[PDB]
Design a protein around this ligand. Structure first.
Ligand SMILES: N[C@@H](CCC(=O)N[C@@H](CS)C(=O)NCC(=O)O)C(=O)O
Ligand SMILES: N[C@@H](CCC(=O)N[C@@H](CS)C(=O)NCC(=O)O)C(=O)O
Lengths: 218, 225
């Protein structure tokens, strides 16, 4: 059976999977779960993913509940021998390391910020606090890009797909003007054909955040 | 060259790596980084890991800055063909899925709670809020254990090592009375010889948290076997 992707394209991790699907030309059935209607809490979805999170992938009997597992699974099944998920161990571990940085550091801080807006309203968020936390993430990624054109080495990998969507999301609020390597990398990522998969959901997130948070991004 | 682990045993992700190192009898050089003295911001360590986090592994030219990459790398290098990081694709993805649950959900909520204690003092923490967030993680893990004997399947995997350290940390505060599958699984993990690598750092974390947060964990909460 073909993979089924439960998604809300406002989610950056969802968009990372949409980018990989477009890049690899994977035939996938999309199923929309409206997060702002709480549809991730529907009984059948909760039974599928008790974390009530998107993306969720069902591929035969395999149920994956994290974008980084989905990216790795789809690359191993549909891009065997490719460069996105390198076969050499040391290169593959470096890609894994940056996927985990996205999960544990960049997305965590991006999510803390956006969730504060949704829960408290923009006017009640300590913007300077989150600017510091997310600027530290920029500084780190700027250092990652010192030696290489891409996040995990000289070529595009799953790590770039994971990071670029969340970065595009934080960039709605905090510009990359002070980080030349990171701004160069982002501009290059935007020139990928597969980057078109990020556009619609980013804009829908922009609109939804501005309405629910009662503010406007700069 | 032998792996070098930069570590503070009070960190649950560090303890997950320490458990794997003991289980596989890997010879590793330990290099202590005291998180509560701010040694992770020393210029040389920041250059090595700009996320200023432990565990950090240096193995030859490879530098890993996340416990879940370290667990996978060490399993592939010293448990080749083993079952901790299974060779069949679907089983391996399930282990990876639960590793990421620990990183994205359980540890995130456990860290939010402990960080608030250190930053604010326990008396100024919204403990009820964090009890709800961490009880929800308990429910999710109970659901996983209702469908499988261990976290990711019928046998011990890297996912159990990653999750048990953070679970034991959360359970210093919040009891597992209402979670029979979690209690049975946790008791089984505590029977492992490798669990010795979790005991000491858990106790040191308990002492440090009580000191810095000016409070006491409820002694009845922690599951002891
Ligand atoms: N680490 C997870 C993060 C998944 C996640 O948090 N998704 C958010 C949207 S960005 C979500 O589904 N929120 C719904 C909820 O938590 O109830 C991954 O990479 O897939
Ligand atoms: N996802 C990372 C989390 C690492 C982490 O946050 N470690 C904490 C200790 S539990 C740390 O080093 N804190 C020091 C700091 O952030 O300055 C992993 O699994 O290794």
């Amino acid at each position: 059976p073909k993979p089924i992707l439960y998604y809300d394209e406002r989610s950056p991790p969802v968009r990372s999977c949409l980018m990989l699907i477009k890049l690899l030309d994977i035939d996938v059935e999309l199923r929309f779960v409206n997060l702002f209607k709480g549809e991730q809490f529907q009984k059948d979805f909760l039974a599928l993913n008790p974390q009530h999170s998107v993306p969720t992938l069902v591929h035969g009997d395999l149920v994956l509940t994290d974008s980084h597992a989905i990216l790795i699974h789809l690359a191993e099944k549909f891009d065997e021998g490719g460069s996105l998920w390198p076969q050499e161990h040391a290169e593959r571990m470096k890609v894994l390391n940056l996927l985990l940085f996205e999960c544990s550091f960049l997305f965590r801080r991006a999510s803390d910020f956006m969730s504060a807006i949704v829960r408290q309203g923009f006017a009640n968020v300590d913007v300077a606090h989150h600017e510091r936390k997310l600027t530290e993430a920029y500084i780190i990624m700027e250092r990652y890009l010192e030696n290489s054109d891409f996040m995990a080495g000289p070529q595009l990998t799953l790590a770039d797909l994971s990071i670029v969507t969340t970065l595009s999301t934080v960039n709605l609020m905090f510009p990359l003007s002070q980080f030349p390597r990171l701004r160069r990398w982002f501009t290059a990522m935007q020139q990928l054909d597969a980057y078109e998969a990020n556009c619609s959901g980013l804009e829908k997130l922009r609109q939804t955040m501005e309405s629910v948070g009662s503010f406007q991004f700069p």
